[PDB]
Amino acid sequence: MRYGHFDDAAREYVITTPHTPYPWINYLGSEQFFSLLSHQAGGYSFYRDAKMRRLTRYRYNNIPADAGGRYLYVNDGGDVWTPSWLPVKADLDHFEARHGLGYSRITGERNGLKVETLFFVPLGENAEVQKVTVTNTSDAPKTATLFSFVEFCLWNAQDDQTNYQRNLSIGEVEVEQDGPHGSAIYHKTEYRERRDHYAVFGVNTRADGFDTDRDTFVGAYNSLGEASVPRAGKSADSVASGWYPIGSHSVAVTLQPGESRDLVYVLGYLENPDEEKWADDAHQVVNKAPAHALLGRFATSEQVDAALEALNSYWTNLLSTYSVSSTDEKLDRMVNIWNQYQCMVTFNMSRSASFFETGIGRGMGFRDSNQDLLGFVHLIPERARERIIDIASTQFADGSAYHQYQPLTKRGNNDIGSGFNDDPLWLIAGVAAYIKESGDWGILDEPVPFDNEPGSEVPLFEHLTRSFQFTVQNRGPHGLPLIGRADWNDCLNLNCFSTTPGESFQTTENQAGGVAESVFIAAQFVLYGAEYATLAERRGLADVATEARKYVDEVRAAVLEHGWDGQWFLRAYDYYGNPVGTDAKPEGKIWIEPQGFAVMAGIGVGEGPDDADAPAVKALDSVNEMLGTPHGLVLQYPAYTTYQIELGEVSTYPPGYKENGGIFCHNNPWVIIAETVVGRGAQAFDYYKRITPAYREDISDTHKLEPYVYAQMIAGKEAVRAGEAKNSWLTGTAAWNFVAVSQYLLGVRPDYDGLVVDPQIGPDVPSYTVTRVARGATYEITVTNSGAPGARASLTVDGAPVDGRTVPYAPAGSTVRVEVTV
Amino acid sequence: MRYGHFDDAAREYVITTPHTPYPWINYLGSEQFFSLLSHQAGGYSFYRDAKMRRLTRYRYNNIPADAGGRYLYVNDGGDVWTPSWLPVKADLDHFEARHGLGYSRITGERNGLKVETLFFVPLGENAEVQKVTVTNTSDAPKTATLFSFVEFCLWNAQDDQTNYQRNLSIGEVEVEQDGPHGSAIYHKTEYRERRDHYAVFGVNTRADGFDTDRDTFVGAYNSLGEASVPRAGKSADSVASGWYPIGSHSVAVTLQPGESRDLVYVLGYLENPDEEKWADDAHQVVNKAPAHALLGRFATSEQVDAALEALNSYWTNLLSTYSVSSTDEKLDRMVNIWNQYQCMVTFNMSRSASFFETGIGRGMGFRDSNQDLLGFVHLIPERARERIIDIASTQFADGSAYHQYQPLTKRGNNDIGSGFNDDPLWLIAGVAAYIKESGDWGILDEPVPFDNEPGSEVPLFEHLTRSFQFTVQNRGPHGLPLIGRADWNDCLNLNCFSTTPGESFQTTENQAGGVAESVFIAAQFVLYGAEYATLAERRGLADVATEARKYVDEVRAAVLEHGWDGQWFLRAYDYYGNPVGTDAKPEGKIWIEPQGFAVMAGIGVGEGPDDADAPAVKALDSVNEMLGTPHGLVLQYPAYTTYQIELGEVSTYPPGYKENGGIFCHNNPWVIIAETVVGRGAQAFDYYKRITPAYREDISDTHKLEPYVYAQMIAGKEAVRAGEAKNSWLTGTAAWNFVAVSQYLLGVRPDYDGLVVDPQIGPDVPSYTVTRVARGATYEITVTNSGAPGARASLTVDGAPVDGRTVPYAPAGSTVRVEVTV
């Protein structure tokens, strides 16, 4: 079954019923202000930081899911309905929701009134704009009253949901029925005290009335679907004191058959300078000047359209860097539109706020945001540059880092734990990807503090050496990196041994001592140690480079001497020195992570894809056979059926979910990439398809979640719910699959000195063209692809053959035509 | 005006409508297992700790409030209603809720079927029991199906509300349709790993069907009021796999005219020893032995009835220690039943969990639980004894203390601030009140650790000297004690100067240095220093005691010299040594806390009530004119209207709410007692009435909250919501009004060496009889009361005049008959 369809020329997903398996959201904004907007207008907005400047309230795990958003009640001769369907659930004659790039449109129609709302966040604005179009589609005149409705949150979302003993007495508003462009309500809780910010909610007309108190608008004993005020047909003009502030205006309209009326609502975030906080000497009345300017910038429909068109241009421009034209429309929509758009969202959000992440505990993750860079550097490299500086500034002098930082302050914290030993190497991954993309070697000279200490600055490159050295100087008895709290796998906690319930494995104190080692970090080290060595060489650091290559060689050797189980790579050595991820144990025999990542590091790669003796092939065959499902590859097999105290969080999940046998999609691209490395493009593309939204759309009732974005977790073969996703949108799966398909499958990837063109996608895509802008020049890459196992490309460039697969960067402004034969 | 009525004979509050101004709850349980139960069956249950072992889920700030709890859906002929009204909101022919002592009864009748439910927690049981009686009140046979419903919480309430990215994949149940006594569902999330406990929801019959998955029982897009399963008329027999586990059973019932059937439901908390967790070698099936036993303990109506009777007998016995019979039946019901019942609840909950406190951040407050002891020591001295040891154990070697502790673990934490300089003297308050009550001098020798440290034990008495020495050694330039983070008033943060939004004043870093002093702590030290000296004197420490009365003298003199403003006591000196609470300032001229506390401490007491030169009289008159309202006494006047950086949290509330001009009811009994001390019984009694539930029942539509219990805060005169309460139930107001009324108004108060009988209540209660069991003997105290201003008692005892107002303690088993003339 399906609940909608892609509309490629519009760059939209079209949702054709409110009755989806799960609320399906879009993200509005790409800069500093963000909205979670469901296909039923549910969700909330925040500025910079979902925990600390949340404008509007949303309830996770509500009954039913997603009753809470931007609503417009229509009262037409006493019948009340919402075009978003929820919360009133009155029958609609027509319903449709279109999720586009930075905007969505939701349309509902009932009994001769059609209400279309366009939602979006304009460029350069901290605001969410709604353009509502009301049309009489009947053959007789209509008169209705439209009540807009938003529920404010008291800024600090955690305090909002836990600290009523204080916060029910602090809610404050001002109401401006007769502003310069229409009516406005101001939410200004704590502006009396330390906050220099307030929210506005306004309409571009003089409203008949307003409401700012939730209880008065909705009524005692009532849900949002039964709200009293729209039922009464007029606003109660409530002025909140404490309790639950809201924004609501009423507008009565009269429309002849065929007539429409537009209305423009704005939810704005405003700041004032401290000296300019107040309109009056007594410090009682907020200074509204920037709110009046914001409302003036969206007083008309034309102004809305001009901003929407600018958003469209801005996206056409972002999507002009990498595109593909082939015989597979599903592939193409992923590569051209959806995966790139998701990559922008993960770049902005990290893992903080979705319909599963609550915008509370999670800030910007050190590993998470470093890997997000891999699928972002080609979109806006100047913002990737800034992000690298921000991440590296949260690293400590010893090369270890804060596991994550607060988006508002850019300062690291331990709220989700510390001492994760794979973290430091991700910084080198990010920087290597960025320099390959841009050629901005100068970033290595950027002075960058440790833990934000003014005066602690060292060149960025020097931070990378701290990362590299951290791993060098923390190896265990087999030459493999000490694991610490956990490696990439947050739930592989070998230094934990917790018997205390309800204390987080992520934050709980760890045992000093033991000998726990990670085969994954070892592989990570070989992969990114190699890049580090390259940057040292280019920095003129000959001895540092030689020394670095010797270490990489040691660790690579140790993976082969001590990290091999026979038919696959080992996962780890536990606190006691016993092997993890071996055929000698009944459960957790084979783990996916070191298979993909060791093979990507080139460890155990032999003659070619038919070399059944090469460890890499053996490892990937055991991944196919033991980990493969129709939905993707599960993390380990078998999943743990009992609590294993030496292994930490992992075995606390029921089998088939999350890190215990779930398909953790983020690591699937590693196996995809590995498969292209050994020359099995067909199987790599197969793996790509199994987890990719466009190919899974036709099973929307099994996947449940958004059919146009990747999810973190798809339940595994050992789950009752096998194939059902959780944790859509915010996942490194997006950036990693974009790396996989754009760079390894399709084969077009920047190197330091040229653009590598090395297709390995197999026979299902026999011809295609990639348009890639790199370093100011456009490469038109025409591929004729046999898909024959281990067949690798030859190139001709502008009519002349070249050797190997690297095309040196042509000068800015040129167009290079590459002709590729596989 | 009223929404119910008291039922004194039954010791109940009878709620005669679903449509109250707010949800009105009861607490069930007095030992280790507790339930919050609204008059619509809303709320939840927890074992020992509301944060860490919460069994069932509840949503604060739901729309509407309190849609969630223990529901019984009745399907009669396809018509679906709940006898709690909510969530279905069906018209009922009859509705009633009775909240009793440790139990409640909720009855709803619709279309010939009456369903009554008794909820209670049985003594000795970690369970909530519901005995349902369905009656056919029509003249023709009837049939219906009943669906029970409870929604589980995943134990850690904070994780439950914030950590879906993990916890949507962990929910686990088992279903036992054919158990020994009926059907049961087991909620066993994380029993797989660190938890040795699970929950059971069962019924004493073989249910027709069951549901454990929330989404299937309620249905997509539906609220609890629209739940699909009851409307369909048949259970879906859902077995949860993650998402949201629930307990539901269907039971088909058939009833002749006038016939009823009892059903008994049990929600239980069970643990197994680690070595008996599992029924099976493979560890997949929970050991149900304890749950079967529990369900067999409530298999019949008879067992339920016998346990309700033992609960009644337990309350009669708790309430036999202090009673009054007077001409004022509002006074009587307060003293005899409600104020004591509330005291039990505050003893058990501290300020952790109500319909306002969320059972997350607030554990067992140091200050709060010490003061709760004052109203509790006469109820169950042995439990008070143990609480003193628990509390004192969270004190540090230098006499300061953890500001609160975690109920489950008994360990201090800093989660809501540290370094509150009033905290340490409350330990003296509580121990003195306990020794006066019990004469248990030997508790002073109890060995007690510092900060639960093994081998740090010293006698309890030494803890009290560390408390006492903390103040003597932390005085500022006027000889008044340094305030630290705050004193009693959590929002007076003089070492704060915070300009950063969104960090809690309670918890934010404080400035070192400065000279900030508290007049409140000074009065506290005068009162409780004296008590300490007496304890030292009894132990024969004449050196210690002499030195101690000297310091008390120095502090008393510092209050008169540097803590007096002209017509009232100063509040504080700020960081820079500027006076706080002085007529020279425009706002916050007079603050209540030092007025009542200084006068309670005997400071500025003169010749009698008519001594117009006496500081105590001028302070109390100023309280009356400037702070007095029909609803009680506001905390300070005038309230601050702009943020005062140097005073911290206080000026951040809008005027008239909480610490900024709210009536903070906890500090009113201090003014009450001060007036008695000074000889103005009439005025003291008036203040008592203003804030007292039985006297405010007539304005239920203004108080809004429960009319049978004290609330923390009544909005003061500068608030638009003047008279509206927030934060009911959990307030030190309960202990302090009980002290005021029983010990100072009625006048019967245990001292170290005899029972003081010193009525001071004025002319509105001209005769009464108190029955006071004290040290094993019973005192029948018959008061005849002129109410003449300043007139104090003379006593005759068993026919013979005695000198003074102290009746030396008679031996255990005696009845002493005391005759009182005022």
Ligand SMILES: OC[C@H]1O[C@@H](O)[C@H](O)[C@@H](O)[C@@H]1O
């Ligand atoms: O703190 C964040 C982590 O929480 C863990 O419990 C989950 O299993 C991980 O997937 C997640 O990354």
Ligand SMILES: OC[C@H]1O[C@@H](O)[C@H](O)[C@@H](O)[C@@H]1O
């Ligand atoms: O930590 C709890 C404290 O929170 C403050 O915000 C409130 O004003 C106090 O009344 C309360 O005792």
Ligand SMILES: OC[C@H]1CNC[C@@H](O)[C@@H]1O
């Ligand atoms: O454990 C695997 C992943 C879980 N989510 C957060 C990621 O950083 C981590 O790699």
Ligand SMILES: OC[C@H]1CNC[C@@H](O)[C@@H]1O
């Ligand atoms: O600030 C006054 C009161 C606030 N609530 C908790 C109490 O500890 C405190 O005295």
